Amino acid sequence: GSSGSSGSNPSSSGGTTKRFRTKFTAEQKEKMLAFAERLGWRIQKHDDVAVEQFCAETGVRRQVLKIWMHNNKNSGPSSG
Question: Domains: what does the record tell us?
Fold first, then answer.
């Protein structure tokens, strides 16, 4: 024999009520960092499944993610 227990990694908490503050893990940040870079920091009708697939992995909510992006992309406005 050799194998002796493995895995089991607790990581999921948060309490909401009436405040703004999200807590994510590097993974999410990293994944998103790229994910967004792919979607172009924008989610379209085509980026529906991809969004679901991502959540199914990371667990980030489209709304959260979508907002996450806006909370990253060039904040300041743009002339035009």
Answer: The homeodomain differs form the typical one by having namely 4 instead of 3 extra amino acids inserted in the loop between helix 1 and helix 2.
